[PDB]
Structures are given as structure tokens and as C-alpha cells.
Design a protein around this ligand. Structure first.
Ligand code: ZN
Ligand code: ZN
Lengths: 565, 442, 214
């Protein structure tokens, strides 16, 4: 009466077992809510997404499941199996009725349906995950760092008993081919089984291993605490649902990892080891109003409270933190060019250029700080690791954020891919026959030292700075030198306000550009717009006026004043 | 311990926790997570002052005494829970660990060196610096088995001395004497219990800055379990209490043996007099300055100001905190722009050898890799190495040939002289490191 | 066996099977999906017809040129020349059996920041089977061939001038290359081929491509 019983439970079917009660409970729940889901998509993908708020709705549809929360948290592998068998029974009953109606005017083979529950609460942070969570169902939310490749994984294996002819679906622990020790029927214990690898009970699915790092407060919770990470295993439809850098919410069971990695030294090898079996994954991709109502100078001076002077440098840093408009026409595939401006700090030692890059990475919600001596090509570009996987580098880790590069005059070919990232918002990969293009929508702020030390002489910027024109033409702002509340304000502005350029702001830029032409790169004008739009996002305004443009022009005037000397 | 010893220990501890140590257990019961390991820190000196035999039995059998302490902690937690008007407002906690702290100050229990084979099996404290930390981990520690004749479910423990490996027994520990030797394992068949204890291996080293530690410090492995994990990081000054044990692996067909003395931790703590009083009375000041300055460096002619300035360098300083919460330094900085061979180098070297917790270098002989930070790597693993400006934290850093350095070695020194900190960003190691030090340059 | 080499375009018919090795005492398992081969083979429409009827020609050139790169002011000849670059070409064969190329070559000697780089990059993203680089950022190791080695084993790695076979290769900062990167480009522009002779890898590789430089 239960077709597919062996697809979820390895036990022998018995109407006296306590499984029937929960199975019929979830079957009632699914029959009452059969119109809420797409049966075709459930059959094709082999899974079903159920809202946890629907199970805890309370009433009549959930009458036979009053303790769904406790049973799911403490016994997930049993509750999910019962739920999957119930939805499979509902689908096969509906399809058998349809097939009978078709025959009147009956072998329906419904495959395995993964019962996936999303939007689970309470949310459990990774730092509070200990060993006692083993066998429990919890939900986490974090940023993806590593995404491995898709690989086949044999979950179950079919075994035919030579005594009674019964075929069982024995699950494998970590994929280890083990032989059953007794026949599942309580009659004969033949203890001799033949493997049936072509049988439908032998379950083989796609498998992926992702790594999740906790959402760490870059200043509050950074008082000696390291960001904790954990491994998650996606299977079947959950495979290829997130890329490195996305913030995803993953609900699943906590299970023991047994490989074991390493080694060595000295020493990150751990025999003792944890991981998460992912059941569902969701990928997204007042004090503020007092601040909006001298806002520019207040945020500017509050970026680095330990750096004296550099008022224009802090002014460009705030503009880069908010950023312009990522004007990507998704309906026209019109590239957004770039809305993230770049900053160059040309200064002598002892000015605090490194401290400005630190504050750039600290106040930003996604900051990556890099020194310019211990440099590797894989430290900034994507890293290829084959047995292949692509590991995000500093130019990829800084996506939707700011990356700071100190002493880049000391970097060699490990730095030239940053030029391709500042312009294409992407990283080029070509190694070991693997060719790809990875995202890198980041804002690059950098600082360097002059050629002959103190350069208050008759030379200009392109001559005194240890840098060629291939990178000088890529910066929106060049400055020549010789916390949590503003963090929330910047994060809210990057998510809420999308700026535009008005006509009054353009007329000011037209007059300055025409007067600059009469004195006789194009990216200079692109900087005027990208910083003006950044000023509109700073003021939480959807449209930048002439006042914002004049301020951006004066900032660019200071950049062009230190230059062209 | 016989029955009398266990009885007296239990009674003394039960009376002590029924009289005091109530708010700690109340706060433990008030927590939400019921499956969590909760520690109960107890001063060992005040506890051993209440009864004479408890200290003897603790120093004689530490593990069983700690087990009895945990049992009595559970009993006292239940008693305090039953004494509340609304017992349902809190929840009982079964994973209670008695963590010993504040041992009687003596050289036999408070150690500054790595314990030897003589101290195996004794409970003591070791003070050192953390040089290495491992990740936080999860895996099994007990395994359930069942008998084929009486269906009695018993449990076997993992041998800590054999790196938590299980050995199959051959006797039924049921209440009725079963002659059955056939047992079945139930560890991997199901997941009915969540019996798994936390585990972390840290590495501590003797502090060469101490007077008792010689030239070459020794290292030691410390095993933290349950709530003791995630309690320290690389570079911390720890005072670890615990039991010195031996973990070993024997010879095999192609494998060699390996024995190791480790420290199973129980609690973690993050860190002539009459003559001096008479010298201070005579100083209370110009004649005292002449004595200190002459005694600081007697191998030099004149240079009264340099001897005085060095005195202030070794003297200062004390940190402060302003209205913005910014740390305001204390440590001094003296520059000696002297002609070569005038003896300025003779100052700094003798001053670095005369002072405990002191470092030195000779400029270009140690670049920024030897002054600040270095990301020591090996496979996909790395740690933080300390330089001259870091090892001198709460100490002195001397740098001869100070202008012979590169502009990037000076930039690193610029940060250490301006923030008490050094920014780390090498390879995959990004952090903010405290370098509260004074710098005596020439 | 012996029916294909490294770099061929194959259409393999066969059965998808699984080869596995189980766990042992000290050995881990490994499962792999392989293809047991059975045969080897070496390798809106109405709108386009209506657009072709209107083109059949000067008004059509203005539409293609404006639609090729609308992000640029003027430069009618550059938009037209790029159109011929993406257009050409077709190989021929003379009386001596020599292969006569088809693919075009356009050089853009423009002042920096005039937008010539905006052309080539959008043109490389708009075109299927297309490659690009920025001169000195990719030397001859990334333009032609590289003998990837490991123990006494090696293979052939394709560069910018090779991956663009039957496609387009764009090179900004074209004069920023070394005289040996240009020599490798000289051969690809003059023979449709690139000579291989690195380590123990000696061969003649076909690089039938067009090169759009700036
Ligand atoms: Zn059977
Ligand atoms: Zn028995």
C-alpha cells in the first residue's frame, strides 16, 4: 500500500510501526495543501520546498503534527523521511487517479522526493555550534567562501537476499560499500546478499561541498575572535545554487565528517571533525534619518578618527564606500560599466597611508586588507586547485566591498591582474587547461611610495611615483601627499538608495569640462559622474543636484591640483 | 580512594556548595541551552582550607576527585533548582564541570617550565605563551554495546592515553553475572544519543622573558575539552591548570612508536626588598639620578643626558585612555645620532642584556620580516611569527643602524611607534597585532 | 584507439558507465562517471531573412555600424572596419596547395582614452568564440603555446592566438609587447599556424584566427 517505502526507510513495512502515524499526518498536510505546490516541478526536480511556518500554522491542516518543531529539531532524519514518503504517497495517489481516468476513456513510477523545509527558526549562529548539535536540525546564515565541483555520490545500494528474494536499499555511510549483516525481514537471516547496482534502489546523486563562514562584525566581535567556518554538503537539486561570495541561509542536519583532512603542518589536521548535511539553501542574489538631516564632513571625519589631515583623502574614501550606480539594464543586457570608484594615495612615508587603507577595510561591510611585500598571484587572483576548484582571492573576496593594497610599488606580476579587475570587474583565469572569468565587482583603494623619497620638487606625479601610466589612468581619484553607526549608514545606503544624475549637475560638469578643454583622458569625466552619484547615495538622495556636483568638482580639482605641477 | 575518602570529599564539597557557590549555579540553570557544558570555577586554596583530607585526596587521585566534584555539582544544581518558587522558569543542566583554579602558590604545583616524567599523573599549573592553535572539532568519545543473552545496554569509554581508541570487551557488566562474551556494537547503527565531547589541541611554550626559563624554551601540547575550546588564540599568555598525562602509539609492522607528555586541561586563565625600600628612602632625587645613571652604563665616559634619557626609556611607561576610548601609550623612544664608534652601540646592547623582557637588532641586519610580522606557511596552514617590534611587547626594542633600513622597514616602525599595533596582511593571515613597546634607536 | 589527438573537436557516441574502487584498510574509495565509446567522429530566422531583404546596402551598413558599438561618438570607419573583421573570412587554396587565409586584421593607433579599448572588449563580449588580452599583460606564454610538464609527461597549452582559432583575438597595448611576443604574432598573422618547440613538445599547430589590435 506504500509504494516507495524502501526509497525512504531501510526497515520492512509494517502497519504496526509508529512511522505510519507521522506518515499519514504529513500525508493529510500535503493533501490539504496540494494546490499550493507545483506537482510537475516536484516530480522533475525530485524535491519539494515546504515553509516551516506552514507546518507550525496551527489549526486543522496541521492537526496531526502539533510537535513538528521538537520532532524536526531532535529527530530530523526520521521526520524528513516520513514527510518525503507522505508527499510521494500523495503524488502517486493523484497520478494513479489520473491514470485510471485516462485508462477508462496504472503503473505510476514517482521517483524519490526530497522533503526540504526552509525558513526554519530559531536561527543558530555558527559560534554556538558545539558537538552536542550532532543529530540535530539547525539553520545558519553566512557567506560562501569555497565551492567545490560536482561529483557523483552513491548514497544507497540495492542488495538482493538469496534466501527469501527480498531486495533492500542499504544506505552507505560516507559512500563506503558495505555489506548488510541481516535480511530486513524478521524471518530469515541469510546474511548473504548480491549487489544490484542497476536497480532503482541504488541511489546515486550529484554532490557538492561548500564552505560557509560566519557573519563576523569586523570591529565589535573582532576582539580576539576568529571567524568560524564549516562545511556543507549539497545534493541533487541543491547543487550549484550559490557562488563564492554570496550570503546564503542553509538549513540542515549536523553530522560527523570522516575523511580526514591534512596533513601537515603545524598543525591544522583534525581527526575529530564536523560538517553540515544541507537540507535546504536560500541564496539572496531612525538614527540613519537623523544622520541624513554637515553630513558629508561628519562621515568623512569619522572614517579614520586617528588620521590627522587628509580631508580630501577621507572625502574620496566616503565616496568610494557608498559608490555610484551599478547601472546594469537587466532587460537590455547593457553593462553597468563601473559604479565603484578607485582611490590612489601618493605620499611619503610617515603620512599614515597604511592607516587609511585599514580604515577603508574596517568601516566597509566587506573589507579586505593586503600588504604589498608578501605577495602571491593566488593572493589576489582566483586560485586553481585540482585533484578542480577555484578559490576566491583578495580581488574576489572584496566583491561588493573595498580592497586595500598597501605598498603596491613592491608588487610584481602578482599585482597586474588588479588592473583587469578595476576595469572589467572580473578576474581572468587560464591555468592547467582551465579557462574562465570570475566576478570581481570591487573598489580598489591603494597607496604607494615615491621614487626618490621626498618629492617636493619640479617633477609631476607620473614621474615621482613608482608606477606607470597603465594604472594611473585607471584611478578615479589620485591624492598627492607630501564607527558602527556610519557602518550601518553606508550599508543602508548601498541597499536602499540608487542614485541618478540630474541636468543641473551635468551643466556644472559641462562648463568645467569646456573650460578645461579651452586650455589646449575620458575616464576623468566618468569619475565625475561616479563620484557625484556616490554623493547622492551618501545624502540618501535618488537624484544628485548641482550642489553635489560642485563638491565633486572641487574634490577633482584638488586631485588635478596635486597633479600637473 | 577508598569509601572513607570518597565519603569525606563528597560531604565537604556538598556542604561547601550548599553554603556558598549558589549564584553561579543559578546563572547556569538560567541559561537556555540544556545540552551545553557549563563550568564552575572554584578556588582550590579556600576549598583545601576547609578540610584537610580533601587536598590529600585531590593531589593523590585528581581524575576521580574531579568526577566526584561533577557529581556533587549536579546534585547541588538540582537542589538549587528545587528551591525556587518557579522551577519551570529555569532548566536543569547535566553537563557540569568543576574547574580548579587558584592552587596554593608553591614550586611543586605552580610551574614555569614544562612538566617532566616525574610529574605524570599530578594536577598542576603551567604558565606559558600560546604558539599554535588548532581548529574546533567534533567526534565520538563513548560507544554503546549490547549483550546477546540479557539484552543489557552498556557503554565503553575511549582511552585518552591511546588517542581515544576503543577496545572490545569480553565481559557483561550487567547487574546479573552473564557468561556471555558475544556483544554487538550500536554506535554506527543509529544516532540515539549525542555523546560527543569537544576537543582542541593547543601548543604552549616556556616564556624566555621569564627569569627561570633559560635560553632555549620547551614546548608542550595541551588538550582542551568541552567548554575549554575556543578560549584562547595564538600569542596569548596562559596559565593552564590540569593533569600531566602520557599519550602513546606502539610499534607495528612498519610503523614506529611515539610517546608524548601532554597536559589534559581543566581550567584556562588568560593573562632585598628591605634594601630597595632603603634605596627609595634615600632617593626621595638628584643624587639618585647620578647613581642610576652611573650604574646603568659605567663603561662610558660622560654622556649624562644619554644615561638619563635611557633611564626614562626603561622607566616609561603607563597606558591611558582618553574620552574617545583611544589607548594612549606609555613607552618611550630615544634616538642616538652619534658618530660610529662613540659607544652608543655599547649602551643599547648592555641595556638589552641587563633588562629582562628585552630585544635588540642592528638595522639592515633585520628587515621588516624580522621586525613586525611574518606569515609562516606550510600546506594550507599558517600562523603568525613575531618580530623585533612584537617580541618587545611590554618590553624594549633596540635598533642600531636605524637609518640603514629601507623605507618599508621604517614604515613598519612608523606604525609601531604611532599605534602600539602592527597590521598583519601576509598570505591568508590578516589581523591586528598589539605591539606595546618602547624603541631605543641609534 | 589512435583515432584522435589532443585538441581535436570530437562527437563521441557511447554508453555512460561508472567505474569505482571501494574503501580498503588504508585506501579511500573513488567513483567516476566515464564514457565507454562506441564510435568517434572528428569535427527569428524569418526576421533575419527580412533584415537581409532590406539590406539588399549603405543603410544596412549604418545600422550594423551603429549597433556594433553604440557607446562611441563618430568613428564610422572603425565601426566599419571592425564589421569586416568579425565578417571575414573564408579560406582558399591556390595552385601550390597553400592555404590562403580569410580572417581580417585591424590596427587602432589611437590616443589612450579615446575609446578604442571600449570597442574591442564589448566586441569580444558580444561575439561567440572570441578572445582578448591587453598586450604586455600576456606575453608569448599566454599568446601561442606552452609545454605544460609534469614528470616525464607533457601536453600542449593554447594561448590567445590559438584559442581564437576560427574566432577573434583582440590585443590592446599591442606595441607594449616584447619583440618575441610580436614574432609569435608575426607567425600567426602570416601562416595561420604557430610552431611548437618547447621542452620535448615539437609540433605544428593551426591558429586560423583574426587579430584586432590597438
Ligand atoms: Zn532474506
Ligand atoms: Zn549479559
Amino acid at each position: 500500500p506504500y509504494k516507495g517505502w524502501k526509497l525512504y526507510f531501510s526497515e520492512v513495512y509494517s502497519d504496526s510501526s509508529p512511522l505510519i502515524e507521522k506518515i499519514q499526518a504529513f500525508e493529510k498536510f500535503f493533501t490539504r495543501h496540494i494546490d499550493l505546490y507545483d506537482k510537475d516541478e516536484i516530480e522533475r526536480k525530485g524535491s519539494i520546498l515546504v515553509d516551516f511556518k506552514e507546518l507550525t500554522e496551527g489549526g486543522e491542516v496541521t492537526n496531526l503534527i502539533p510537535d513538528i518543531a521538537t520532532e524536526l529539531r531532535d529527530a530530523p532524519e526520521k521526520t524528513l523521511a516520513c514527510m518525503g514518503l507522505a508527499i510521494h504517497q500523495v503524488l502517486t495517489k493523484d497520478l494513479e487517479r489520473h491514470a485510471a481516468e485516462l485508462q477508462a476513456q496504472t503503473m505510476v513510477n514517482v521517483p524519490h522526493i526530497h522533503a526540504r523545509v526552509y525558513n526554519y527558526e530559531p536561527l543558530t549562529q555558527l559560534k554556538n555550534v558545539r558537538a552536542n548539535y550532532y543529530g540535530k536540525y539547525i539553520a545558519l546564515r553566512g557567506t560562501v567562501v569555497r565551492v567545490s565541483n560536482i561529483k557523483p555520490l552513491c548514497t544507497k545500494m540495492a542488495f538482493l537476499c538469496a534466501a527469501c528474494g527480498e531486495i533492500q536499499s542499504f544506505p552507505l555511510p560516507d559512500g563506503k560499500y558495505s555489506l548488510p549483516t541481516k535480511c530486513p525481514v524478521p524471518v530469515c537471516r541469510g546474511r548473504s546478499f548480491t549487489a544490484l547496482r542497476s536497480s532503482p534502489l541504488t541511489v546515486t546523486m550529484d554532490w557538492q561541498s561548500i564552505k560557509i563562514q560566519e557573519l563576523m562584525s569586523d570591529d565589535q566581535r573582532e576582539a580576539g575572535r576568529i571567524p568560524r567556518t564549516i562545511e556543507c554538503e549539497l545534493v541533487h537539486d541543491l547543487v550549484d545554487s550559490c557562488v563564492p561570495g554570496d550570503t546564503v541561509t542553509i538549513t540542515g542536519i549536523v553530522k560527523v565528517s570522516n575523511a580526514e583532512e591534512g596533513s601537515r603542518n603545524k598543525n591544522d589536521k583534525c581527526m575529530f571533525l564536523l560538517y553540515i548535511e544541507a537540507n535546504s539553501i536560500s541564496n539572496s542574489k531612525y538614527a540613519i534619518q537623523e544622520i541624513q538631516a554637515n553630513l558629508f564632513k561628519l562621515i568623512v571625519n569619522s572614517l579614520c578618527p586617528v588620521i590627522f589631515g587628509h580631508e580630501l583623502v577621507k572625502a574620496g574614501l566616503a565616496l568610494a564606500l557608498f559608490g555610484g550606480s551599478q547601472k546594469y539594464a537587466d532587460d537590455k543586457n547593457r553593462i553597468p560599466i563601473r559604479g565603484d570608484p578607485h582611490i590612489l594615495v601618493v605620499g611619503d612615508p610617515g603620512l599614515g597611508k597604511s592607516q587609511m587603507l585599514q580604515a577603508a577595510c574596517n568601516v566597509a561591510p566587506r573589507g579586505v586588507y593586503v600588504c604589498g611585500n608578501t605577495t602571491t598571484t593566488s593572493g589576489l587572483t582566483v586560485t586553481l586547485s585540482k585533484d578542480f576548484a577555484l578559490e576566491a582571492g583578495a580581488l574576489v573576496l572584496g566583491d561588493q566591498g573595498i580592497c586595500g593594497i598597501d605598498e603596491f610599488d613592491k608588487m610584481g606580476n602578482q599585482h597586474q591582474a588588479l588592473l583587469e579587475a578595476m576595469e572589467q570587474q572580473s578576474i581572468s583565469l587560464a591555468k592547467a587547461g582551465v579557462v574562465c572569468s570570475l566576478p570581481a565587482r570591487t573598489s580598489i583603494i591603494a597607496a604607494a611610495n615615491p621614487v626618490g623619497g621626498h618629492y617636493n620638487k619640479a617633477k609631476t606625479v607620473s614621474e615621482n611615483l613608482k608606477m606607470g601610466s597603465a594604472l594611473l589612468s585607471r584611478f578615479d581619484l589620485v591624492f598627492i601627499l607630501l564607527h558602527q553607526l556610519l557602518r550601518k549608514y553606508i550599508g543602508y545606503a548601498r541597499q536602499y538608495v540608487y542614485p541618478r544624475l540630474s541636468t543641473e549637475a551635468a551643466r556644472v560638469l559641462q562648463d568645467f569640462y569646456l573650460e578645461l578643454r579651452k586650455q589646449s583622458t575620458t575616464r576623468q569625466l566618468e569619475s565625475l559622474i561616479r563620484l557625484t552619484e556616490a554623493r547622492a547615495r551618501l545624502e540618501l538622495r535618488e537624484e544628485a543636484t548641482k550642489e553635489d556636483a560642485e563638491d565633486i568638482v572641487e574634490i577633482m580639482k584638488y586631485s588635478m591640483l596635486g597633479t600637473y605641477s | 580512594m577508598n569509601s572513607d575518602q570518597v565519603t569525606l570529599v563528597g560531604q565537604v564539597f556538598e556542604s561547601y556548595v550548599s553554603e556558598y557557590h549558589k549564584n553561579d549555579i543559578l546563572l547556569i540553570l538560567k541559561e537556555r541551552d540544556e545540552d551545553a557544558h557549563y563550568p564552575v570555577v572554584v578556588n582550590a586554596m579556600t576549598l583545601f582550607e576547609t578540610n584537610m583530607e580533601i587536598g590529600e585526596y585531590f593531589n593523590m587521585f585528581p581524575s576521580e576527585v574531579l568526577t566526584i566534584f561533577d557529581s556533587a555539582l549536579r546534585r547541588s544544581a538540582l537542589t538549587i533548582l528545587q528551591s525556587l518558587s518557579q522551577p519551570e522558569a529555569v532548566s536543569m543542566k547535566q553537563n557540569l564541570h568543576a574547574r580548579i583554579s587558584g592552587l596554593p602558590v608553591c614550586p611543586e604545583l605552580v610551574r614555569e617550565h614544562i612538566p617532566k616524567t616525574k610529574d605524570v599523573g599530578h594536577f598542576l599549573s603551567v604558565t606559558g605563551t600560546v604558539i599554535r592553535t588548532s581548529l574546533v572539532k567534533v567526534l565520538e568519545f563513548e560507544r554503546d554495546y549490547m549483550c546477546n543473552k540479557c539484552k543489557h545496554v552498556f557503554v565503553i569509554k575511549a582511552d585518552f592515553e591511546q588517542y581515544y581508541t576503543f577496545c572490545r570487551p569480553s565481559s557483561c557488566p550487567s547487574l546479573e553475572s552473564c557468561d556471555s562474551s558475544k556483544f554487538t556494537c550500536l554506535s554506527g547503527l543509529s544516532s540515539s544519543p549525542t555523546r560527543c565531547r569537544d576537543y582542541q589541541e593547543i601548543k604552549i611554550q616556556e616564556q624566555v622573558q621569564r627569569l627561570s626559563v633559560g635560553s632555549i624554551p620547551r614546548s608542550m601540547k595541551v588538550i582542551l575539552e568541552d567548554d575549554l575550546v575556543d578560549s584562547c588564540k595564538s600569542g596569548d599568555d596562559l596559565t593552564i591548570y590540569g593533569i600531566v598525562m602520557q599519550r602513546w602509539k606502539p610499534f607495528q609492522q612498519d610503523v614506529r612508536c611515539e610517546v608524548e607528555i601532554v597536559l589534559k586541561a581543566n581550567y584556562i586563565q588568560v593573562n632585598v626588598q628591605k634594601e630597595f625600600e632603603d634605596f627609595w628612602e634615600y632617593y626621595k632625587p638628584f643624587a639618585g639620578r647620578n647613581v642610576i645613571l652611573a650604574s646603568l652604563c659605567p663603561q662610558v665616559f660622560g654622556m649624562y643626558l644619554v644615561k638619563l634619557a635611557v633611564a626614562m626609556v626603561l622607566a616609561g611607561g603607563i597606558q591611558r585612555t582618553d574620552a574617545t576610548g583611544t589607548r594612549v601609550r606609555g613607552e618611550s623612544h630615544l634616538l642616538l645620532v652619534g658618530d660610529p664608534g662613540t659607544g652608543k652601540s655599547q649602551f643599547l646592547k648592555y641595556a638589552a642584556k641587563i633588562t629582562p623582557r628585552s630585544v635588540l637588532t642592528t638595522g639592515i641586519g633585520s628587515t621588516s620580516a624580522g621586525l613586525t610580522v611574518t606569515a609562516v606557511k606550510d600546506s594550507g596552514e599558517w600562523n603568525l611569527e613575531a618580530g623585533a617590534l612584537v617580541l618587545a611587547d611590554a618590553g624594549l626594542c633596540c635598533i642600531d643602524e636605524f637609518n640603514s633600513l629601507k623605507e618599508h622597514d621604517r614604515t613598519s616602525i612608523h606604525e609601531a611607534m604611532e599605534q602600539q599595533t602592527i597590521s598583519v596582511a601576509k598570505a591568508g593571515l590578516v589581523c591586528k597585532l598589539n605591539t606595546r613597546t618602547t624603541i631605543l634607536a641609534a
